[PDB]
UniProtKB/Swiss-Prot annotation:
<dbReference type="GO" id="GO:0098901">
    <property type="term" value="P:regulation of cardiac muscle cell action potential"/>
</dbReference>
<dbReference type="GO" id="GO:0005876">
    <property type="term" value="C:spindle microtubule"/>
</dbReference>
<keyword id="KW-0963">Cytoplasm</keyword>
<protein>
    <recommendedName>
        <fullName>Calmodulin-1</fullName>
    </recommendedName>
</protein>
<feature type="domain" description="EF-hand 2">
    <location>
        <begin position="40"/>
        <end position="75"/>
    </location>
</feature>
<feature type="binding site">
    <location>
        <position position="64"/>
    </location>
    <ligand>
        <name>Ca(2+) 2</name>
    </ligand>
</feature>
<feature type="binding site">
    <location>
        <position position="137"/>
    </location>
    <ligand>
        <name>Ca(2+) 4</name>
    </ligand>
</feature>
<dbReference type="GO" id="GO:0044325">
    <property type="term" value="F:transmembrane transporter binding"/>
</dbReference>
<dbReference type="GO" id="GO:0071346">
    <property type="term" value="P:cellular response to type II interferon"/>
</dbReference>
<dbReference type="GO" id="GO:0031982">
    <property type="term" value="C:vesicle"/>
</dbReference>
<feature type="binding site">
    <location>
        <position position="92"/>
    </location>
    <ligand>
        <name>Ca(2+) 3</name>
    </ligand>
</feature>
<feature type="modified residue" description="Phosphoserine">
    <location>
        <position position="98"/>
    </location>
</feature>
<feature type="modified residue" description="N6-acetyllysine">
    <location>
        <position position="91"/>
    </location>
</feature>
<feature type="modified residue" description="Phosphotyrosine">
    <location>
        <position position="135"/>
    </location>
</feature>
<dbReference type="GO" id="GO:0060315">
    <property type="term" value="P:negative regulation of ryanodine-sensitive calcium-release channel activity"/>
</dbReference>
<feature type="binding site">
    <location>
        <position position="21"/>
    </location>
    <ligand>
        <name>Ca(2+) 1</name>
    </ligand>
</feature>
<dbReference type="GO" id="GO:0051592">
    <property type="term" value="P:response to calcium ion"/>
</dbReference>
Length: 142
């Protein structure tokens, strides 16, 4: 949405477009991915291309890249904001939000709850039944 921003996304695109022809092919996406220790199959690479390839011509060009890369940024943004929230709630940072941790954090906001009420909250979120709220469950609740 800004000329600086459009240029930033160009540079990102340039790493994928290895031969500089304005398109990213499956192989070029394959070359890049295998530079990052991911070894995806030929059909996995076609799927990733198809997802972004809006006009179905088989490759991704800069406009299509731009569109994808913004959404990825707008999704990775919020996912970090949900992790940091989860971390403020997960007091001992072990990966699971407990009744005591929820009660304790809610209290320091102001919302002083009972053990019954905090159990109900945890139950309302505890999809996997482990008696605690993990990240997956935390994100669905929000
Ligand atoms: Ba086009
Ligand atoms: Ba295309
Ligand atoms: Ca290319
Ligand atoms: Ca915990
Ligand atoms: Ca759980």
């Amino acid at each position: 949405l800004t000329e600086e921003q459009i240029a930033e996304f160009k540079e990102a695109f340039s790493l994928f477009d290895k031969d500089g022809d304005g398109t990213i092919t499956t192989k070029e996406l394959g070359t890049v991915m295998r530079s990052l220790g991911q070894n995806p199959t030929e059909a996995e690479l076609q799927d990733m291309i198809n997802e972004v390839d809006a006009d179905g011509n088989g490759t991704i060009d800069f406009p299509e890249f731009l569109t994808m890369m913004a959404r990825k940024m707008k999704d990775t943004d919020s996912e970090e904001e949900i992790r940091e929230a989860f971390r403020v709630f997960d007091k001992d940072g072990n990966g699971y939000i407990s009744a005591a941790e929820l009660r304790h954090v809610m209290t320091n906001l102001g919302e002083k709850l009972t053990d019954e009420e905090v159990d109900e909250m945890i139950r309302e979120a505890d999809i996997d039944g482990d008696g605690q709220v993990n990240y997956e469950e935390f994100v669905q609740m929000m």
